[PDB]
Amino acid sequence: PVLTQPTSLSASPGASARLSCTLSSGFTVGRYSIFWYQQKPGSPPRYLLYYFSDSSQHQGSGVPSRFSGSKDASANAGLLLISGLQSEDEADYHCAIWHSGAWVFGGGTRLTVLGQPKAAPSVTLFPPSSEELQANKATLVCLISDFYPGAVTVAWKADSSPVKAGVETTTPSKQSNNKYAASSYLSLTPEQWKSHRSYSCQVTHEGSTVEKTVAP
């Protein structure tokens, strides 16, 4: 994209967060004002600040000084710096620039402020049921649970080959144990399911990748 932001980031309370907004090479960061927004769950984004340079910037009203902007010329990136991290700072942080008659947004970075021990995900993968197959359908169900922070990436494979078509994945949400869970689905035809040696659901969470495999 024009603006590239890391999908997620985590840091401890009282520490500092450095959120990057990398502009593609056609857009020299030195020429652009970078706008930042903070979005908390089920709530609209909140204007934090904009930064062009030390002599050209403005803080949003009600936004504390611990939120500040900066730039990394060598990385061609706008930066949102957050000092003295509090649990309330946990949010989706969006960067934006203006160019040629349109606003452009980054993908947003989900910042977690660590409030419990990290935990690798447990993965359970269900093959298509006999009943579903007999109804001329096939669905693989990958259930992911017990992980923290609540950011994972899900990849499906047919044999050893990646598969993107027919994939739907839910946003992770907390269960009763205060840890996150999510679900992913792979839609197939009964013949696709029966003609392959195996299918796999592969889940990445920080430094770990957990993969389960089913076969017809």
């Binding site: 609209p44 204007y47 969006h94 349109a102 269900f126 049921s129 009943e131 579903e132 169900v141 259930l143």
Partner: protein, 217 residues
């Protein structure tokens, strides 16, 4: 100042998405306004802006052929029209009052006051009850797949609500077909598999359907 987006939550593909933003404690004529949307689990996208004073507009070039943004100073509103919608137009839609400040004689605009946002779903699907399939299994995980229903929501219980421990029901996905699917799972002792009967109870009020599926090893 308060902004409240209003409009149909469901639009059929190729049809027109219409939304109104009611503004209170402020005047339309004295500010700039913008529409912004956010597809489920995705980032933001600026749709377009309108000047409350001149009525002139500025639309996102990638959305040019779809967008109409107008104002109604009479009722202190401003509206969004998106023609010929597709699945890409499924999103939470925000109406926004723009902020404006002069820094070194340069005009800086930002998104100042936001409405709560409204979800608009694009689907050709009509009301349809779910198909429920068993997810057959120390401890053992079993569940039921609640597939191809419309619209939301459904609720799931186990053994008529007598089983709650270890029960986890996941959020629904919107498939490319325009129908929803979700799954519920429960973790039970393996030794109970041959003695205990496990049934998931699925309730879909919009179609007045309840489906009970016995899940067996």
């Amino acid at each position: 100042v308060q902004l409240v987006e209003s409009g149909p939550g469901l639009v059929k593909p190729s049809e027109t998405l219409s939304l109104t933003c009611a503004v209170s404690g402020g005047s339309i004529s004295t500010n700039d306004w913008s529409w912004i949307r956010q597809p489920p689990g995705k980032g933001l996208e600026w749709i377009g802006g309108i000047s409350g004073s001149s009525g002139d507009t500025d639309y996102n070039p990638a959305l040019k052929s779809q967008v109409t943004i107008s104002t109604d100073t009479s009722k202190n509103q401003f509206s969004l029209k998106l023609t010929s919608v597709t699945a890409a137009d499924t999103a939470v839609y925000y109406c926004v009052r723009e902020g404006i400040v002069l820094v070194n004689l340069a005009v800086k605009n930002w998104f100042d006051v936001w409405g709560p946002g409204v979800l608009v779903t694009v689907s050709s699907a009509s009301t349809k009850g779910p198909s429920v399939f068993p997810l057959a299994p120390g401890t053992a995980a079993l569940g039921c797949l609640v597939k191809d229903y419309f619209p939301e929501p459904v609720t799931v219980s186990w053994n008529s609500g007598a089983l709650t421990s270890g029960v986890h029901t996941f959020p629904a996905v919107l498939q490319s077909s325009g129908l929803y699917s979700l799954s519920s799972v429960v973790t039970v002792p393996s030794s109970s598999l041959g003695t205990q009967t496990y049934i998931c109870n699925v309730n879909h009020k919009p179609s007045n359907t309840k489906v009970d599926k016995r899940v067996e090893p």
